[PDB]
């Protein structure tokens, strides 16, 4: 499932962290792999900000990135614009979508192992 | 009592003690115990100066029991002990929680995250440097010192306060 | 007191045994974590290529 | 660096995708999954024959 | 009447032996750590009681006949011990000794003495078994054969050298010609160990240059090894016989050669100095 989101001014960065963490907590099926989240810089934009969090898992590791937009030029009551990315994926998923597969977490970590086997040892 | 420091809270008969009671021992160990003939004659738990619990059942004034549990409440085996080992290298809190509830860097024995201050090491009670052969207590005072055997064990086994690479 | 104190001694030895186990695990963990981190950097560079 | 080589087959799958993209589908995420379902029978067989 | 005592002496006396462990009589020893209980829990010296402090006064531990406990000792971690040293000056028939480096070097050189076990019961004290004894500070040790075999004693000093004059086999360094020195003869007076002393001394010296850790024995800590130590000390310092003998006398008070060995040592002195500088006519030899 997903959580539901504050407004641009109702949001605070800590509230953002908690909301994202709770969204990841709504992930369930392989959630024997447990998440924890990391804080990532504000990006400053002409009439807008972005602010960022990473998520990491441990049970090789899985990780996720969440994005939040803030409207310098439109109301504090503007509902927040949020999107999130997996470190492998180009896909700017959005909380209202059909939920991710945790299977992709399995797939990602497996692919990481496969490249671990691949390693060209051009090592310093 | 006085002449060693022992203490008891319970009933007396002929002047010698016969009780269901809590108790203190001049270890400053605490105990809860039953007595006969002025002796322990009970199934009773011994609460350490460090709080943790040993248990003691008494036959004719001698002990016959096995149980231990740490002051944190970690349940323990004196034999075979299956803990933070081949089945899973997770500590007590990390096995109970799994990933510690918010993933603070206490996915390790002590944190929030820092370098070991002096140099020295972590071996849980104390800081020790192989370049000084001295152990220290977490108030950065002192602990028992050690020559080559224990020094070499620390050197290989545990975590120095090296610079954080 | 004789019985209690000898019991206390062996218990304190077991306490040392645990403390050793946890200290060793911490030593292992630091190295393993940081090598895994650089292995992940290598991995992601390969991914980016 | 571990280098790579270009086999065929993938190219034909991308070609099919671009051709159906030539429809300019909406519904993209599921439209593409459905497109692969359509491949599952029809385009896979065709590709297998097409190579020569 | 407060005095400084080297930790090497602590390792000599507290594992001094004479059939018994001297720890199995209390008038031999007292040692009283004024400091925290919690340090004492983490460990203490190998008969050292825990002091009781009360409103910053100390509660006299008359665990022993303090009046005459002949060796009488205190340690902090380093050098509140000092004032306890002062108070003690009233007491013992002997002066009162402070342990220079109360903990840090003494057990830093010899960990094993640390232990969480408080008392050792009279059976347990009497049952105690000695670690090897130290001759040249930090560098060369003295031992009896069952110590030299004892796996823990050997391992804990991180030792690998043997130095011995005896017939009787030992388990380690067999044929390691450079990290074994062994000579074979009885403690019979016609054993002309004089020549062998030069080889022994050079071998020990080489381990000094190598910083190898070396044990010496003559089966029982008795005699041949004692004379070899007299030779070693005299040649190592260009000292007189009487100086080396005085040092040896404390090193382990049982140590003693024999009168033909005394003659050999007297010739060793005359060879090094050119003349006899010590007179053997006293009984103190």
XYZ file of C-alpha atoms in Angstrom, chain B residues 26-28 49 125 133-134 142-150 152, chain E residues 37 42-43 77-78 103-104 107-111 114 155-158:
34
model
C 28.520 -8.826 50.828
C 29.340 -9.097 47.189
C 26.567 -6.499 47.201
C 25.871 -6.376 41.677
C 34.057 -3.167 28.765
C 49.324 -2.937 26.814
C 46.870 -1.030 29.049
C 41.993 2.414 33.660
C 41.615 -1.344 33.517
C 43.773 -4.432 34.067
C 46.941 -4.483 31.946
C 48.021 -7.346 29.706
C 51.176 -8.847 28.213
C 51.672 -10.832 25.048
C 48.976 -13.534 25.118
C 46.025 -11.226 25.780
C 47.890 -10.770 20.766
C 35.219 -1.971 43.689
C 37.506 -6.384 36.567
C 40.601 -7.751 38.319
C 46.902 1.998 38.857
C 49.902 4.305 38.485
C 49.428 -1.833 37.800
C 50.296 -0.543 34.380
C 50.627 -6.776 34.633
C 51.316 -5.184 31.234
C 54.442 -7.348 31.398
C 52.568 -10.249 33.084
C 48.848 -10.280 32.317
C 44.767 -10.412 36.661
C 53.078 -19.829 25.605
C 52.205 -16.885 27.858
C 55.739 -15.458 27.896
C 55.699 -15.855 24.077
